[PDB]
Amino acid sequence: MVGLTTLFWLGAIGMLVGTLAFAWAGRDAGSGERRYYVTLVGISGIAAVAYVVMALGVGWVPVAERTVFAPRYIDWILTTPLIVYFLGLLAGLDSREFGIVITLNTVVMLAGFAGAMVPGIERYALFGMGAVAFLGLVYYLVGPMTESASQRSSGIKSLYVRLRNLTVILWAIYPFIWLLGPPGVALLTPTVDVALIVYLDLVTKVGFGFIALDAAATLRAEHGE
Amino acid sequence: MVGLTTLFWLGAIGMLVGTLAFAWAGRDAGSGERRYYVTLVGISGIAAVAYVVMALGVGWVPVAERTVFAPRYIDWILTTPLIVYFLGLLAGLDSREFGIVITLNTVVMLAGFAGAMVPGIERYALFGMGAVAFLGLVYYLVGPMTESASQRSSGIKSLYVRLRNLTVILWAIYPFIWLLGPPGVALLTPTVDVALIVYLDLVTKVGFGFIALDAAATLRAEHGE
Amino acid sequence: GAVFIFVGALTVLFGAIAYGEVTAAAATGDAAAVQEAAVSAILGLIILLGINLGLVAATL
Amino acid sequence: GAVFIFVGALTVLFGAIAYGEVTAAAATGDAAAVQEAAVSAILGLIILLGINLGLVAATL
Ligand SMILES: *C/C=C(C)/C=C/C=C(C)/C=C/C1=C(C)CCCC1(C)C
Ligand SMILES: *C/C=C(C)/C=C/C=C(C)/C=C/C1=C(C)CCCC1(C)C
Ligand SMILES: CCCCCCCCO[C@@H]1O[C@H](CO)[C@@H](O)[C@H](O)[C@H]1O
Ligand SMILES: CCCCCCCCO[C@@H]1O[C@H](CO)[C@@H](O)[C@H](O)[C@H]1O
Known part of the structure; x- marks a missing residue:
């Protein structure tokens, strides 16, 4: 009776482990690497809180014969822009460029949230808004931002x-889970939906961080360290 | 009503395509490559006949509340030793060594066939006989025969x-399908069982052949051609 | 590229076939029949993953 | 090596969870409930394959 809470606790544990790992890895970080470690801690830390809240049975919203989790979308709204921020820092973006990508990202996240809380075909119009904003975000990440990073x-x-x-690759899967999951046609049950998202969230946040941590030493050596 | 026959016809078509491809590819083969092309034609050709027979609804045996296909096992008994023969030719085996591997292979195939036609836990004893013979075959392929091939x-x-x-890798999957399929605990339905075997058979026979065909030109160049 | 497409396409094909069996069983109204078709589909997909992984490792 | 093990292990884990839902639905006796759990499992496994493939391509 409810392995849902079990899945949420597993997500919380994974995010917590990541949060602690990143915090420790940045204990003696330089004044140039600092922001990077702090950002990773914020990404996984906030995600950890969202999972704990859901694991405690809070934020569960039984929308029209379906079940959506408010904390999931709130988490995304607040953490995805930190991921974009981290990427933007590596690319070497200026205030203007950061504002563009953060705006697009927020549209995506807000669209999914609103759509999840909206009954009727109108939720698909909101999904469309997020999908288009996402394609714009992908363009910036693979185009302008990649060219900027090439100067580093x-x-x-x-x-x-x-x-x-x-x-890019993993974020592209979330909209499919949204469409096929409870928010959309509800072909995926809450349990399956939650299991897939727990996996994706751990990779896009904790996996993401470990890859950065694994590159840290090499990056220091580049500057003569 | 019966996509089973459809799957068998698809297997027949795939084997036929392979048979024709190998036959054509060996049209101008030398006196040294000849046996290789002829063997490939025999491997896929016999498999093609077995699939056509099953597609026509022949050889279907409704053993104790389960459905087994005699042509499948007859095919294996006659084609797997040709695959071993092809590998043995590449390794450069002598009559004795060939006899050893062909004996082991036959034990495997005969065990699976007998076990599939036998009701009761006795079929598991037959499976065991085949499983042990298979491990012996794997040993020869990765050991003695690999050392022999190293002299080429x-x-x-x-x-x-x-x-x-x-x-080695794909043959190792067949026993699991046998155990989980109709012959064993019957957790896999006939349709799913047949679909998985059609896929594996095409790869282990037609895929196998195409890899050899792709290497032909390079092998000729090695001898100064 | 072509391999991801190949295995992805086939997996979808297998899923469709599996889905077909589940739907047909459901039409009968027998929960037990559906469960058998469903278990077969799950195990079949896991095995299919094994085949695809083995193929990739053997070629790449 | 470790990656094949990782994705294979996880796929089996997902299958077990999916199987659990199908079994629970079957216990009710409602063929429709089982079908819903089964369709979810099939689609979920296909998506899981997408995630694993994407992960591999992004890292390897
Ligand atoms: C840790 C959480 C992460 C990295 C979440 C990423 C989520 C997305 C990329 C979601 C995208 C969506 C769309 C492109 C369309 C609208 C629906 C969403 C919000 C599921
Ligand atoms: C085209 C057909 C091929 C390459 C068939 C290969 C079949 C096997 C390697 C079967 C092996 C089995 C065992 C190891 C144990 C007993 C049951 C069998 C026959 C399924
Ligand atoms: C998660 C740990 C990975 C750290 C990667 C950071 C390496 C980036 O490099 C740093 O980028 C800064 C730009 O803000 C520059 O000011 C620094 O001089 C430069 O060393
Ligand atoms: C399917 C097409 C692939 C052909 C690969 C065959 C190349 C093997 O090479 C051949 O092996 C023979 C051993 O019987 C030798 O006698 C030949 O001299 C040698 O060229």
Whole structure:
């Protein structure tokens, strides 16, 4: 009776482990690497809180014969822009460029949230808004931001590309789970939906962070350290 | 009503295509490559006949609340030893060594056939006989026969290894389908069982052949052609 | 590229076939019949993953 | 090696969870309930394949 809470607790544990790992890895980080470690801690830390809240049975919203989880979407709204921020830092973006990508990202996240809380075919119009904004975000990540990253060191460009590929490819799967899951046609049950998202969230946040952590030493060596 | 026959016809078509491709590819084969092309034609050709027979609804045996296909096992008994023969030719085996591997292979195939036609836990004893013989066959392919192949050209050794890996890895899956399928605990339905075997048979026979065909030109060049 | 497409396409094909069996069983109204078709589909998909993984490792 | 094991293990884990839902539905006796759990399992496994493939391509 309810392995849902079990899945949420597993997500919370995974995010917590990541949060602690990143925090520790950045204990003696330089003044240039600092923001990176702090950002990773924020990404996984907030996700950890969202999972704990859901595991405690809070934020469960039984929308029209379906079950949506408010904390999931709130988490996304607040964490995805930090992921974009991390990528933007590697690319070496200026305030303007950051504002563009963060705006697009927010449209995506807000669209999914609103659509999940909206009964009727109108939710598909909201989904469309998010889907289009997502394509714009992908364009910026693979285009303008990639060209910006190319002006950095080979190690930075290499890291940017690896994290960008992980992000683009895996983020592209979320809309399919939304459409096929409870928010959309509800072909996937809440349990299956939650299991898939727990897996994706851990990879896009914790996996994402570990890849960055694994590159840290090499990046320091590039500057003569 | 019966996509089973449809799956069998698809298997027949795939085997036929392979048979024709190999026959054509060996039209101008030398006196040294000849046996290889002829063997491939026999492997896929016999498999093609078995699939046509099953597609026509012949050889279907409704053993104790389960459905087994005699042509499938007859096919295996006659084609797997030709695959072993092909591998043995690449390895450069002598009559004695060929006899050893062909004996082991036959035990495997005969065990599966008998077990499939036998009701009761006794079929598991027959399965065991085949499983042990299979491990002996794997040993010969990865051990003695690999050392024998190492005495041939780099191209031959390379081809042997590629085909040996495909064989060992994929052949190892058949016993699991047997155990979980109709012959064993019957957790897999006839349709799912047949679909998985059609896929495996095409790869282990037609895929196997195409890999050899793709290496032909390089092997000729090795001898100064 | 072509391999991901190949295995992805086939997996979808297998799923469709599996889905067909589940739907047909459901039409009968027998929960037990549906469960048998469903278990077969799940196990079949897991095995299919094994085949695809083995194929990739053997070729790549 | 470790990646095949990882994705294979996870797929089996997902299958077990999916199987659990199908079994629970069957216990009710409602063929429709089982069909819903089964369709979810099939689609979920196909999506899981997508995730694993994407992960591999993004890292390897
Ligand atoms: C840890 C959470 C992450 C990285 C979440 C990423 C979520 C997305 C990329 C969601 C995208 C969506 C669309 C493109 C369309 C509208 C529906 C969404 C919100 C599921
Ligand atoms: C084209 C057909 C091929 C390559 C068939 C290969 C079949 C096997 C390797 C079957 C093996 C079996 C065992 C190891 C144990 C007993 C049951 C069998 C026959 C399924
Ligand atoms: C998660 C740990 C990975 C750290 C990767 C950070 C390496 C980036 O490199 C840093 O980028 C800064 C831009 O804000 C520059 O000011 C620094 O001089 C430069 O070393
Ligand atoms: C399917 C087409 C692939 C052909 C690969 C065959 C190349 C093997 O090479 C051949 O092996 C023979 C051993 O019987 C030798 O006698 C030949 O001299 C040698 O060229």
